[PDB]
Structure formats: structure tokens, C-alpha cells
PDB file of C-alpha atoms in Angstrom:
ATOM      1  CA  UNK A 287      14.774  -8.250  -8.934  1.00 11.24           C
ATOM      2  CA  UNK A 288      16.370  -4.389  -9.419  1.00 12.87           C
ATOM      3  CA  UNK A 289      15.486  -1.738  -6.969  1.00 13.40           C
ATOM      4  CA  UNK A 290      14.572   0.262  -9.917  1.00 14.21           C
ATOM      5  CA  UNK A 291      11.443  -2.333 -10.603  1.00 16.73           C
ATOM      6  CA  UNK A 292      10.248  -1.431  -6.551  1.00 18.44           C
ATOM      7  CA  UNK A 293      10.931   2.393  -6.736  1.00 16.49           C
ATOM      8  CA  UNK A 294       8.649   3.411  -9.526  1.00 17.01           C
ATOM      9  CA  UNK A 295       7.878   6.621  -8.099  1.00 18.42           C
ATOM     10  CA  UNK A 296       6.265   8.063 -11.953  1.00 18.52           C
ATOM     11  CA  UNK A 297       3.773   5.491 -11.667  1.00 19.75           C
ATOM     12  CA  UNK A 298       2.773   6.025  -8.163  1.00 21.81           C
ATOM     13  CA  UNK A 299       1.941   9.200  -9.958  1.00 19.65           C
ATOM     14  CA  UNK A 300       0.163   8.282 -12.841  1.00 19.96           C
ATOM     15  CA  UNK A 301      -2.205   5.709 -10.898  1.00 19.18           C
ATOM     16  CA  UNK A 302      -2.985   8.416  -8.609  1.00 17.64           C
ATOM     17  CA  UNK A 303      -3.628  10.829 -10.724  1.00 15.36           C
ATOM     18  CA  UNK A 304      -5.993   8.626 -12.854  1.00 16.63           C
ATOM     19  CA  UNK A 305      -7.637   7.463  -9.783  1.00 18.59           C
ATOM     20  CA  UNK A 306      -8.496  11.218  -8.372  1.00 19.60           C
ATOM     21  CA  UNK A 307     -10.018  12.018 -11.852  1.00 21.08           C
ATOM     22  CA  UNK A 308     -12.126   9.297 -11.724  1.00 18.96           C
ATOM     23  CA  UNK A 309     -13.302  10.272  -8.073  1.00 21.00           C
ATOM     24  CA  UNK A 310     -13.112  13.647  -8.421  1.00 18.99           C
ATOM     25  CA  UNK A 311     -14.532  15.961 -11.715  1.00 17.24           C
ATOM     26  CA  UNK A 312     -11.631  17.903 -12.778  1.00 15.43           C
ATOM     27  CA  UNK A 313      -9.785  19.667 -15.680  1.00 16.26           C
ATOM     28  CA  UNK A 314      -6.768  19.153 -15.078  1.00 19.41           C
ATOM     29  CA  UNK A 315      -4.342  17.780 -12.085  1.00 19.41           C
ATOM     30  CA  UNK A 316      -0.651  18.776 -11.840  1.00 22.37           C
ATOM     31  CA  UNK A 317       1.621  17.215  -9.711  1.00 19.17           C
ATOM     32  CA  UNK A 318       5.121  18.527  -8.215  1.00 17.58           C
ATOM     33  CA  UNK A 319       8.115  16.948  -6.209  1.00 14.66           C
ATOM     34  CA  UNK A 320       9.375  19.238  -3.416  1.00 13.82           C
ATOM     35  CA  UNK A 321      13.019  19.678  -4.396  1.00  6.22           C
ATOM     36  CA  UNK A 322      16.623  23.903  -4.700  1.00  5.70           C
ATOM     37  CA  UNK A 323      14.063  25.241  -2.723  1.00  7.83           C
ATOM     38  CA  UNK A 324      11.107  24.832  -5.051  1.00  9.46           C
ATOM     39  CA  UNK A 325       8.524  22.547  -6.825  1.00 10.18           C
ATOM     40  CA  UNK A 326       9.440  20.501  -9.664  1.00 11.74           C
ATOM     41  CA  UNK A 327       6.844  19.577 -12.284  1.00 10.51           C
ATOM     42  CA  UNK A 328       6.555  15.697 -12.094  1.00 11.06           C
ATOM     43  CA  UNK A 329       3.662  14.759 -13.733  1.00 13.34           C
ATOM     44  CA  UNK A 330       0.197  16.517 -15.296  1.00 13.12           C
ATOM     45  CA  UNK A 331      -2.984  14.869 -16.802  1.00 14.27           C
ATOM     46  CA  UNK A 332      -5.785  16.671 -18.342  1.00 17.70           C
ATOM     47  CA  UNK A 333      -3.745  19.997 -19.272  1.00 18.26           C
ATOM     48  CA  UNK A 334      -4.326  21.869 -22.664  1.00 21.16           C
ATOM     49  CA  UNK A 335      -1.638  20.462 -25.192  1.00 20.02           C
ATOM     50  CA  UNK A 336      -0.441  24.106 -25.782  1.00 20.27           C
ATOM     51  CA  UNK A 337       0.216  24.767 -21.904  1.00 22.25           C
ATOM     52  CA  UNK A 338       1.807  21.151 -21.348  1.00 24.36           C
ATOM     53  CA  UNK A 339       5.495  22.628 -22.095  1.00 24.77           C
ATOM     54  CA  UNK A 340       4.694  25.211 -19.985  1.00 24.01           C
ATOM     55  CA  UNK A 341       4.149  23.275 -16.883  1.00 27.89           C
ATOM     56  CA  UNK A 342       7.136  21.327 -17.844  1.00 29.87           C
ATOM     57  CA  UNK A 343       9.472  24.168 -17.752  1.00 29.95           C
ATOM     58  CA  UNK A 344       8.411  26.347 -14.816  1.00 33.98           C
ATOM     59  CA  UNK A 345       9.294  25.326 -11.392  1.00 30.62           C
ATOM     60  CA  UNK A 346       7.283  26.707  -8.298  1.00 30.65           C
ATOM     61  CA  UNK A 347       9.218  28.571  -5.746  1.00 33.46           C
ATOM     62  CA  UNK A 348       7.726  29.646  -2.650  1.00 30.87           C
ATOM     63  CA  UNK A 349       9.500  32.694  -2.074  1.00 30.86           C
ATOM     64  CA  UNK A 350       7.849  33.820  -4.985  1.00 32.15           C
ATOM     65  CA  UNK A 351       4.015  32.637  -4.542  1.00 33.82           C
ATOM     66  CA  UNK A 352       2.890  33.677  -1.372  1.00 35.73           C
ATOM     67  CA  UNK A 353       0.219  30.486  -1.496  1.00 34.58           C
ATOM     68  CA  UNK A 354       2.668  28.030  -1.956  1.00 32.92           C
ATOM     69  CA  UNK A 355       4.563  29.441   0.709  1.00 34.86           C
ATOM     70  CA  UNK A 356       1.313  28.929   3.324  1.00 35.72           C
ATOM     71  CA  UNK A 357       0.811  25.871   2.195  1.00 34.94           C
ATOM     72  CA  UNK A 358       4.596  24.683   2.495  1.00 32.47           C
ATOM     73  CA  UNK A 359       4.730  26.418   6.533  1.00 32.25           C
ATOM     74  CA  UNK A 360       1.268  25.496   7.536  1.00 34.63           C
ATOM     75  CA  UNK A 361       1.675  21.697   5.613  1.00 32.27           C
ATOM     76  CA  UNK A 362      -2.155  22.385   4.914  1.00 32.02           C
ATOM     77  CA  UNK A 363      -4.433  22.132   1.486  1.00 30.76           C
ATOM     78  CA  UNK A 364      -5.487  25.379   0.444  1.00 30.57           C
ATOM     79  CA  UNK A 365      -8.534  26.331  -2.421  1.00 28.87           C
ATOM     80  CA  UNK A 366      -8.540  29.618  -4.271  1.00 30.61           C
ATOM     81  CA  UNK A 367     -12.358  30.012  -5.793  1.00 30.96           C
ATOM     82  CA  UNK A 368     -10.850  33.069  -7.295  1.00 34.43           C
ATOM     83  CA  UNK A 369      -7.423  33.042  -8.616  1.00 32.75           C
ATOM     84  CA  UNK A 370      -7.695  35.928 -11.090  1.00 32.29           C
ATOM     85  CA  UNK A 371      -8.087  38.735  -8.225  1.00 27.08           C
ATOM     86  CA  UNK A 372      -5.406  36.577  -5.935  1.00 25.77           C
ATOM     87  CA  UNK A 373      -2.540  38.933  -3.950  1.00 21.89           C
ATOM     88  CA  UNK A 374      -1.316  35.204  -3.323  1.00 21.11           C
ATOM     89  CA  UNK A 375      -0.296  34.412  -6.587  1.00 23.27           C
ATOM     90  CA  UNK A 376       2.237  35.620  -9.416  1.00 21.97           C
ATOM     91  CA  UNK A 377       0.539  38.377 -12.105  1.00 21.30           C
ATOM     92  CA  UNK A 378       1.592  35.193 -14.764  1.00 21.16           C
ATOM     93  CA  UNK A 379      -0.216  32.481 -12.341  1.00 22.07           C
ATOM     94  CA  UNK A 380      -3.255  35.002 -11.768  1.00 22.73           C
ATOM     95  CA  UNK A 381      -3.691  35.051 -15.439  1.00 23.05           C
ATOM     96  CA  UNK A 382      -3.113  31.823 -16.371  1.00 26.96           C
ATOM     97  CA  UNK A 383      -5.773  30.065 -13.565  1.00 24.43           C
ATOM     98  CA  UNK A 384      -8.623  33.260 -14.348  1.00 22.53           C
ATOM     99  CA  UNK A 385     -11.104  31.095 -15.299  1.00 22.41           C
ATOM    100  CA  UNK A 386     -10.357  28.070 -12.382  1.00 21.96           C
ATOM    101  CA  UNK A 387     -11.499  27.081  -8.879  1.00 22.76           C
ATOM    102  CA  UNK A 388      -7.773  25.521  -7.467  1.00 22.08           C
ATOM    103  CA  UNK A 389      -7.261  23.393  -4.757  1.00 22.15           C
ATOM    104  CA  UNK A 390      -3.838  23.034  -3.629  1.00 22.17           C
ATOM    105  CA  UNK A 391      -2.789  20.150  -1.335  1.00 22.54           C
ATOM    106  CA  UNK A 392       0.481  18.933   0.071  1.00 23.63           C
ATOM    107  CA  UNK A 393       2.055  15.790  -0.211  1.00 23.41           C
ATOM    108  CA  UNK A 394       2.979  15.399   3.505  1.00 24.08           C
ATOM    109  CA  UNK A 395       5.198  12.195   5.218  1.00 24.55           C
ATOM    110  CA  UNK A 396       4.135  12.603   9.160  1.00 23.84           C
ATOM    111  CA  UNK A 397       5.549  16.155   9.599  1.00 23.68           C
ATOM    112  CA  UNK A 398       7.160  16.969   5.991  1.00 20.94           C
ATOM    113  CA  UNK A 399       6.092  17.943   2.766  1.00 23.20           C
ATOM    114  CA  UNK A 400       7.939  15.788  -0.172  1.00 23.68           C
ATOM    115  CA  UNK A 401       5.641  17.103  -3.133  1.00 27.70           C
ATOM    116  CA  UNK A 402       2.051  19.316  -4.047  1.00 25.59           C
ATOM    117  CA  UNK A 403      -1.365  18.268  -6.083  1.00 27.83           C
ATOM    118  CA  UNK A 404      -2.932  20.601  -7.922  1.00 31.26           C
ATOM    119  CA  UNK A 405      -6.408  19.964  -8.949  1.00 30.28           C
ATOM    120  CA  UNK A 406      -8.434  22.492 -11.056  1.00 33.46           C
ATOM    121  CA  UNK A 407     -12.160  22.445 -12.620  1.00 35.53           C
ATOM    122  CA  UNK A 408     -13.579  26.428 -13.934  1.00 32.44           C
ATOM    123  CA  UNK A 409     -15.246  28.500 -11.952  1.00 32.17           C
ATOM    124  CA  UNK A 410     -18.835  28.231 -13.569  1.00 34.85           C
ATOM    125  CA  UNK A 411     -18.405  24.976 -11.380  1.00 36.58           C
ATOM    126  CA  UNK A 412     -19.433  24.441  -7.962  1.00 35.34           C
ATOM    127  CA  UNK A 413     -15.869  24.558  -5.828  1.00 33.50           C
ATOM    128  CA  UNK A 414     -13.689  21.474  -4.158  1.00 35.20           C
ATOM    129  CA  UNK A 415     -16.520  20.332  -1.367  1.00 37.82           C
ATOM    130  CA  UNK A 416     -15.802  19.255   2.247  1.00 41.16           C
ATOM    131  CA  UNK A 417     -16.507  15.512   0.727  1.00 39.75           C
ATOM    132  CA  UNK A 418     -14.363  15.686  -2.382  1.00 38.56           C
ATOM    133  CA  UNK A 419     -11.644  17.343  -0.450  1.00 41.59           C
ATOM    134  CA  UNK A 420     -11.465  14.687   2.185  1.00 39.34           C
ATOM    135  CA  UNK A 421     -11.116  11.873  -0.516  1.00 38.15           C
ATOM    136  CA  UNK A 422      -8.258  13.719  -2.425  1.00 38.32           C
ATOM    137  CA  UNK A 423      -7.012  14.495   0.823  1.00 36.13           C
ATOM    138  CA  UNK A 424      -6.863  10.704   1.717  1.00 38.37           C
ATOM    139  CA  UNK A 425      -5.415   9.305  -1.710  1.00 39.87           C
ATOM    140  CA  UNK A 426      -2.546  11.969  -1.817  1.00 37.21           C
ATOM    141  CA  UNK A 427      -1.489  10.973   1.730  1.00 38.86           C
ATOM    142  CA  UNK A 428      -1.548   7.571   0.708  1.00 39.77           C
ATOM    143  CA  UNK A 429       0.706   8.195  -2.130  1.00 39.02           C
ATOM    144  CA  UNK A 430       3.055  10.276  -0.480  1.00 40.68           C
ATOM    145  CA  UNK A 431       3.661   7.748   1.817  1.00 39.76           C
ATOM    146  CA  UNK A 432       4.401   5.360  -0.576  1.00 41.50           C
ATOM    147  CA  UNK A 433       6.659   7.865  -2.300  1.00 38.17           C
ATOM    148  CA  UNK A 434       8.336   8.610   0.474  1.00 38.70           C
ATOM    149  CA  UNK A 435       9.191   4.877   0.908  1.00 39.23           C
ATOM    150  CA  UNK A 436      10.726   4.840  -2.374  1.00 36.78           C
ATOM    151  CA  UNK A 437      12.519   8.019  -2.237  1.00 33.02           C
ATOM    152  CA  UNK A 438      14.561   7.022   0.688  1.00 31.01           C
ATOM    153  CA  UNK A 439      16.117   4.890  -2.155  1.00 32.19           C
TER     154      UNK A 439
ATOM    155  CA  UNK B 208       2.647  10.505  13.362  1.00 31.08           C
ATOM    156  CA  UNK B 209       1.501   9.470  10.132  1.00 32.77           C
ATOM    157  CA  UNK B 210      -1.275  10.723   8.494  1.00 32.59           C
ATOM    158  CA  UNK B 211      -2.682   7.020   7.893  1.00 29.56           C
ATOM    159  CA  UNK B 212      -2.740   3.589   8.717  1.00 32.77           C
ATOM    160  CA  UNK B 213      -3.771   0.198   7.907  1.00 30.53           C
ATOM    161  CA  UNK B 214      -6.782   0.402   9.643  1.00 32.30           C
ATOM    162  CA  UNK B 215      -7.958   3.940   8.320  1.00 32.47           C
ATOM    163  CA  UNK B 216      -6.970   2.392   4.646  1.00 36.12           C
ATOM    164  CA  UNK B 217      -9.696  -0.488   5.060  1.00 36.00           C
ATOM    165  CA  UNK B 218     -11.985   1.759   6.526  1.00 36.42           C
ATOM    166  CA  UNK B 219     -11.666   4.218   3.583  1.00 38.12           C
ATOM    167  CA  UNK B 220     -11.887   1.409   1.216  1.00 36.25           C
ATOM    168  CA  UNK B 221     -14.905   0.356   2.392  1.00 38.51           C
ATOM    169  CA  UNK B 222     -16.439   3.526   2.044  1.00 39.71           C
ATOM    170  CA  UNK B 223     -14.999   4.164  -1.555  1.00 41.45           C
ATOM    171  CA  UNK B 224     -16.724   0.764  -2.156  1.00 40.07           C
ATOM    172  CA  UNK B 225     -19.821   1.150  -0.667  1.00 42.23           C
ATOM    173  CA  UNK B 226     -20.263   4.451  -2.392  1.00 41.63           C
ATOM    174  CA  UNK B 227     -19.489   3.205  -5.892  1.00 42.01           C
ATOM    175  CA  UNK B 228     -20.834  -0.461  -6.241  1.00 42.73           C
ATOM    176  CA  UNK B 229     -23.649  -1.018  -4.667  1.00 43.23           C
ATOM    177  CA  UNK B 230     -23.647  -4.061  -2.045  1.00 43.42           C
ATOM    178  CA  UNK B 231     -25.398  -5.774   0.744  1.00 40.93           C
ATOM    179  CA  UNK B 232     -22.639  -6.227   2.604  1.00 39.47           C
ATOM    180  CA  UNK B 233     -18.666  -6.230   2.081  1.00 39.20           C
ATOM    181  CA  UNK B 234     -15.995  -8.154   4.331  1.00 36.57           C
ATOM    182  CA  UNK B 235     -11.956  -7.504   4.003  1.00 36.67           C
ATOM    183  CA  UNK B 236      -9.686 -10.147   5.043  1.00 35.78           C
ATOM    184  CA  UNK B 237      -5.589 -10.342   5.348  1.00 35.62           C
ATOM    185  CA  UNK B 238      -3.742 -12.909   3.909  1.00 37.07           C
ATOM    186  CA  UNK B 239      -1.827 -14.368   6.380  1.00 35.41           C
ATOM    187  CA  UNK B 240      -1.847 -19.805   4.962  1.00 39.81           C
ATOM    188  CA  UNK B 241      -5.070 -18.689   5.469  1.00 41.58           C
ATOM    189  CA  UNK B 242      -7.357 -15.275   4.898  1.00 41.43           C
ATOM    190  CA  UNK B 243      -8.071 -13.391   8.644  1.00 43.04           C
ATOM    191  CA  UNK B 244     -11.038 -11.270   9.233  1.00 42.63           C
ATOM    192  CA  UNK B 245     -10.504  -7.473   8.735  1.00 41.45           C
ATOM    193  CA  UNK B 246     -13.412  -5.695   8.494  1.00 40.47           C
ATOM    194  CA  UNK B 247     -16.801  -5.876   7.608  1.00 41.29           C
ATOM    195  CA  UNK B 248     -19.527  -3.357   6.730  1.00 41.93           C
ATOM    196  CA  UNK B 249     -23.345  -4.454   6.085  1.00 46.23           C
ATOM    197  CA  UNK B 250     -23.447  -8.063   7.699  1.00 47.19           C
ATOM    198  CA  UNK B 251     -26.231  -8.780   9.465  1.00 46.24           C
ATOM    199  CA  UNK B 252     -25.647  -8.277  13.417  1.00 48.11           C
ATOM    200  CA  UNK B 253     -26.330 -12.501  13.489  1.00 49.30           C
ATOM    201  CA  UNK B 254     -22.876 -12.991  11.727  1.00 53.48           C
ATOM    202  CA  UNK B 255     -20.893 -11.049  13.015  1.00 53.37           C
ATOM    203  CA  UNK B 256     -19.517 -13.688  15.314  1.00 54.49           C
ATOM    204  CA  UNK B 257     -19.024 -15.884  12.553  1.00 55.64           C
ATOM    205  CA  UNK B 258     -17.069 -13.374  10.442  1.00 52.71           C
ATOM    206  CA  UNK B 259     -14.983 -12.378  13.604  1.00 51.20           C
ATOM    207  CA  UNK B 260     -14.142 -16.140  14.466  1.00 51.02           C
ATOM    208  CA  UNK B 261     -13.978 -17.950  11.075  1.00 52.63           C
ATOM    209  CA  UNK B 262     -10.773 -17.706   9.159  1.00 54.40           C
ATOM    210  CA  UNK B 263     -11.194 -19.186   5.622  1.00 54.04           C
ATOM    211  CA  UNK B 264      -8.537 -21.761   4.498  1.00 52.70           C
ATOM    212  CA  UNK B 265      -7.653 -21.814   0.683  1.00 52.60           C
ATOM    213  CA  UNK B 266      -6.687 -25.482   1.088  1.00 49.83           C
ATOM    214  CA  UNK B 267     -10.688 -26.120   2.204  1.00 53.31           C
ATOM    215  CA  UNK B 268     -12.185 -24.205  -0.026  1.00 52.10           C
ATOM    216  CA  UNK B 269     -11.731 -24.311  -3.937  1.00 53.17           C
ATOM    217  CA  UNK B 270     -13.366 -21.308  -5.106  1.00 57.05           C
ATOM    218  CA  UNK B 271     -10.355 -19.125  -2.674  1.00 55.25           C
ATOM    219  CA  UNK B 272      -7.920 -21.681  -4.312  1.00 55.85           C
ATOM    220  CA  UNK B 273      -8.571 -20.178  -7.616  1.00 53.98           C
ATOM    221  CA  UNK B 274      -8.521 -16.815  -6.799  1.00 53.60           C
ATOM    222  CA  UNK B 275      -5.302 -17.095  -5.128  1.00 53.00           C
ATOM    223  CA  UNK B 276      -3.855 -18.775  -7.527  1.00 57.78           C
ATOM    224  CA  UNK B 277      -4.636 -17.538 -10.709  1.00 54.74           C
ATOM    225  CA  UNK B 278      -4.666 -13.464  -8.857  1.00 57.27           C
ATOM    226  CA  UNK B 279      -8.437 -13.351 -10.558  1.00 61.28           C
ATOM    227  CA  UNK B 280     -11.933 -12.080  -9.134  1.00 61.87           C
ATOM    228  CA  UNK B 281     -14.351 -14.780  -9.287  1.00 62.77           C
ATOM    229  CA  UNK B 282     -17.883 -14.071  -9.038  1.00 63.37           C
ATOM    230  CA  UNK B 283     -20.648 -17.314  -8.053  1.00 63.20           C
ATOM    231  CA  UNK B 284     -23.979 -16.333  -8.731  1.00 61.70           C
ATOM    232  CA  UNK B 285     -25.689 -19.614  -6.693  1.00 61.52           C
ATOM    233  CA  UNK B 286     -23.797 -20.071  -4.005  1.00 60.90           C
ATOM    234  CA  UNK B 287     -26.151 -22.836  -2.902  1.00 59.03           C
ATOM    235  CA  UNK B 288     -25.074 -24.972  -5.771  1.00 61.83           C
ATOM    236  CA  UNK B 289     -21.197 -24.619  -6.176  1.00 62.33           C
ATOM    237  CA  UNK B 290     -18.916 -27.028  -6.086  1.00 64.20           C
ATOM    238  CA  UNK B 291     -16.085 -24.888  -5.113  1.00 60.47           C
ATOM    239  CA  UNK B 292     -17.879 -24.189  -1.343  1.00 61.91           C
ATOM    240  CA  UNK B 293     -18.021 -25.821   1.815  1.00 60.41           C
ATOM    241  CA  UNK B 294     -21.600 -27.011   3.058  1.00 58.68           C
ATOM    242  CA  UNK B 295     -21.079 -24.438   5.637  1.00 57.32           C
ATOM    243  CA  UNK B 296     -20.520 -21.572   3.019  1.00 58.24           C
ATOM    244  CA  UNK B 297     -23.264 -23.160   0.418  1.00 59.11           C
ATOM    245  CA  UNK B 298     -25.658 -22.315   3.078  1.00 57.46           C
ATOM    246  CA  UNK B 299     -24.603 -19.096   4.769  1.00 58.42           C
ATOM    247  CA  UNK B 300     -24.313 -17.711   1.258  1.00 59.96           C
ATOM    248  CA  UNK B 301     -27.056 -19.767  -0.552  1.00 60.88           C
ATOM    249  CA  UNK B 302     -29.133 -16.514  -1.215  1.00 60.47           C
ATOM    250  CA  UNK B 303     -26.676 -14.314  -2.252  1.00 58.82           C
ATOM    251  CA  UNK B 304     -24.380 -13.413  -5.227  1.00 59.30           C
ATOM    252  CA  UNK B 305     -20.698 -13.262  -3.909  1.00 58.90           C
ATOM    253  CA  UNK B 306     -17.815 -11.519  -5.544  1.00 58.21           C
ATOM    254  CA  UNK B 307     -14.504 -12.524  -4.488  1.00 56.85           C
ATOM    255  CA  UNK B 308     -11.697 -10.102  -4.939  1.00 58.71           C
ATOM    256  CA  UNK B 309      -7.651 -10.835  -4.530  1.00 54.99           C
ATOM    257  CA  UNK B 310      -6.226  -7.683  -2.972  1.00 56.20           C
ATOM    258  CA  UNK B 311      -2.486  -7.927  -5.121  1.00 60.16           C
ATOM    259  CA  UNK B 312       0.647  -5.750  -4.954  1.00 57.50           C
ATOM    260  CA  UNK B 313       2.964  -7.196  -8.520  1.00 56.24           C
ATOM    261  CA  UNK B 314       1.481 -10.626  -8.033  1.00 52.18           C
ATOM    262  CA  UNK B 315       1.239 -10.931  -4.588  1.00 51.55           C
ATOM    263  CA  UNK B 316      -1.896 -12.074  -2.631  1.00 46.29           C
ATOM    264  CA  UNK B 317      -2.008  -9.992   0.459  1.00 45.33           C
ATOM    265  CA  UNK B 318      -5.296 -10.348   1.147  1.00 44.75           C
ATOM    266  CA  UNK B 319      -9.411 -10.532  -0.052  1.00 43.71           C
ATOM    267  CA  UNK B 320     -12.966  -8.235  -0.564  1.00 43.18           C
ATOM    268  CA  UNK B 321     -15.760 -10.152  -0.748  1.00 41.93           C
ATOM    269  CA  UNK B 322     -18.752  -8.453  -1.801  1.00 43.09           C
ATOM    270  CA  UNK B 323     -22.433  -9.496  -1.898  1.00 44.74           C
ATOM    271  CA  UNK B 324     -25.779  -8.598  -3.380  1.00 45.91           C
ATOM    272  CA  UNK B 325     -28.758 -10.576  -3.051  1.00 45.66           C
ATOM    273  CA  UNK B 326     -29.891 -13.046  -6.099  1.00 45.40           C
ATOM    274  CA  UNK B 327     -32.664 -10.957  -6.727  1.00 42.65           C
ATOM    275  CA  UNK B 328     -30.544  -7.849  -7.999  1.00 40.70           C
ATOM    276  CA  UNK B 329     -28.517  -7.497 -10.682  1.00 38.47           C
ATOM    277  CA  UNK B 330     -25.031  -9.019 -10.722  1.00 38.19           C
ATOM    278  CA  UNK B 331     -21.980  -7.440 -10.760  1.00 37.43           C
ATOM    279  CA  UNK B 332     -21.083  -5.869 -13.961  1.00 34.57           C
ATOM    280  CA  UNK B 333     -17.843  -5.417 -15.994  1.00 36.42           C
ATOM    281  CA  UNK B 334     -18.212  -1.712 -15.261  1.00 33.96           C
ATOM    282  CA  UNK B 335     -18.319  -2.366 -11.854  1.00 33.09           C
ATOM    283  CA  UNK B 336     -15.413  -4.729 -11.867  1.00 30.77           C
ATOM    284  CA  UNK B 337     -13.594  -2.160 -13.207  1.00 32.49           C
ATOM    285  CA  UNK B 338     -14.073   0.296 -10.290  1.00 32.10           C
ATOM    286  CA  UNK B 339     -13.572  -2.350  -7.769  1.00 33.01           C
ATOM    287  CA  UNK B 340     -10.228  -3.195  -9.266  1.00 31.15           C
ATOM    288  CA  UNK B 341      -8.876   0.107  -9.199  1.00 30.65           C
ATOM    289  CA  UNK B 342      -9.849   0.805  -5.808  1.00 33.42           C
ATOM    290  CA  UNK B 343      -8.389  -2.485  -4.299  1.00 33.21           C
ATOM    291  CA  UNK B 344      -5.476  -2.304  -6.134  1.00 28.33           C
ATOM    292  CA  UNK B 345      -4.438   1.228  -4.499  1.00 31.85           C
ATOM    293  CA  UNK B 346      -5.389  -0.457  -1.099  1.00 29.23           C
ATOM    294  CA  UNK B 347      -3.334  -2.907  -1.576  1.00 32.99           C
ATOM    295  CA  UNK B 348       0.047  -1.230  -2.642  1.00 35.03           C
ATOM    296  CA  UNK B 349      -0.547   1.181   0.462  1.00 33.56           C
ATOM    297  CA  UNK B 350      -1.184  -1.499   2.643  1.00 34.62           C
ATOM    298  CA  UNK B 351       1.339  -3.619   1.627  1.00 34.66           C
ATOM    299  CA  UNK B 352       3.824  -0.873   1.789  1.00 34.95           C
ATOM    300  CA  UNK B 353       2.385  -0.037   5.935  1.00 37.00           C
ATOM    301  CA  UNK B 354       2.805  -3.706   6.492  1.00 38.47           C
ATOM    302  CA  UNK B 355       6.442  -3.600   5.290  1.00 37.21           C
ATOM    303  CA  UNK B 356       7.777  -0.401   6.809  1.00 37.47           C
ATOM    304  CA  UNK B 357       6.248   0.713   9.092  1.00 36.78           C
ATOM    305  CA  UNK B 358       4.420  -2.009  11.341  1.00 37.64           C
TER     306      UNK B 358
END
């Protein structure tokens, strides 16, 4: 009856998010709207408790991360196997992901990106495959476009 | 250009499915008052005309009554048997078990997976009820949302 009932864009969020994790084996996924300039935290599942108000305070700027930036330009997923030694990240983000395999994909609407999903498992694990990346791939498109269909609200 | 569309949603569905829950075959229909063929994967080559050419009326057959109306799964383990078939369906589906799924967007019917196994397997499970639910249900907000706005 209220727009608000039809523009739930937190739980197109959540049900993705559960949805990947159940497709996908992961630690943890974090999820950003594409504002300012910069990512906004919108949603995480599977983060340490202790890093949760972390993620909830630090937005992602591209003129600062030089992966973030790529991926923004080139509107293409990108996977660092080893974050740690990364020139593309922040000393703070190179620390904090040491011990992860990240995939980084972008919430793209035909030619725009609205958004990011971050999806992270540790690096004694085998990497994001061709197989699992075309699934995640798939679901966050779907989503986006969904999103964006809300958003326009 | 969008990086989707209805068709590449079924398609993907279908896959997700096949993957998951193991089936003989799977068929996808749109609710239109009746259910129209979508897309099948696993019939036998002998039925594919029939699945192309034979839209499936709620108002002729019970068991799709139900489902519509109470926006439930409903699984028949002897086809042969039920009440809630046509002859025609009794006998195309008399060796099979048959899981009927509503494809719903906030009560809406928008459309149906059916999914078979043989009698001689295990039925569908909870467990795999579960998966199947989750899976359709992201279908069908996407789809609904293609159908919509941008069709």
C-alpha cells in the first residue's frame, strides 16, 4: 500500500547476501552503496563481532584505494589472492585482509555502478573459481537491478 | 544493455536447480488465467511438443488450483492415482514423483517449477524444499521486477 513496503532496498540485501553464502563458501561478505564520491557500508554478514563497527564507520573512497578505483572505471570484478603485499590497497586495508583471498565485484545497472560486494574466505583456501565467480557474478547483477528499480524512488 | 534478462534468469535457475536437487527433468512456466510454457531442461525429446503446446489451466486441474491458491508447493508421489489430475496428466506423469512449485513475489503467483524424479528414487526432502524455495523465490522477485520495468 506505501512505497516504502515496495522499496525495501536492506532486504534486497540481506536475501542476497544469505543466498551467496549458501552458494558460495565464504567468511564474510560486505556490501556497499555507491554514494560523496565513495562507498557506503550497507550491509555485512559473517564479519568478526569486534571488526563489525569498523566496517560500519569507514567509507571506501576510490581516490584513495587504487583497486576500488579499477574496479569503479573498468565496472569489472576484481580478486586479490594476496592482499597483504597489495600496492592496490591502503597500509590499514593491507593489514586488515593479510590472511584473505578477496573478490571484489560491482553492482552495475547496464553501464553504471550503484554499489560493490565484497566476498572473502583465507588464503589457506583455494581462491574465487571461474564457476563460483560466474554465480556471484549473476546474483549481484540481479540484485542491482532490482535495487536500482527501487532507488529511482 | 542490461546485464540480464528474463530469459537468462530461467536459464540460470535451471542450472542452480539442476545442480542442487537432483531431478529427472524440470519445466518453468509463466503465469499468465492459465500457466505458459517457459522452459524445460531434462524432458524426454518425445515431449517436448507436448510441453511447448500444452498450457495448463488451474480451473482444469485441482492439484494447480491449490497451489495457486494457497501460494504452497505440493508434492504427489503417484501421479497415476490422484484425484487432483487430468487423465491426460495421470498418465504422462503416472511413473514419476512431481513437485509443483508457485514462483511468488509478496503473494503473487507469477508463475510455476515443476520438478520430477522417478518413483523409484527418493522423494523430495524438506532439505531440499528448502533450497528450492530460496532459489525460486529470488527468480521470481527479479523476474517480476523485468516484467514490470523493463519489458
Amino acid at each position: 500500500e506505501r512505497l516504502s513496503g515496495l522499496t525495501d532496498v536492506d532486504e534486497v540485501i540481506k536475501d542476497l547476501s544469505r543466498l551467496l553464502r549458501k552458494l558460495v563458501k565464504t567468511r564474510w561478505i560486505a556490501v556497499y552503496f555507491f554514494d560523496r564520491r565513495d562507498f557506503a557500508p550497507a550491509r555485512s554478514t559473517g564479519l568478526p563481532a569486534s571488526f563489525l563497527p569498523v566496517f560500519r564507520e569507514m567509507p571506501l573512497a576510490p581516490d584513495k584505494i587504487p583497486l576500488l578505483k579499477s574496479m569503479l572505471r573498468k565496472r569489472q570484478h576484481l580478486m586479490l589472492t594476496d592482499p597483504g603485499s597489495s600496492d592496490l590497497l591502503t597500509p590499514k586495508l593491507r593489514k586488515l585482509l593479510r590472511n584473505l583471498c578477496v573478490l571484489a565485484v560491482p553492482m552495475v545497472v547496464r553501464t553504471q555502478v550503484i554499489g560493490a560486494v565484497f566476498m572473502a574466505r583465507t588464503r589457506d583456501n583455494p581462491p574465487f573459481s571461474d564457476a563460483e565467480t560466474a554465480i556471484i557474478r549473476d546474483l549481484v547483477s540481479h540484485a542491482a537491478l532490482v535495487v536500482s528499480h527501487m532507488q529511482l524512488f
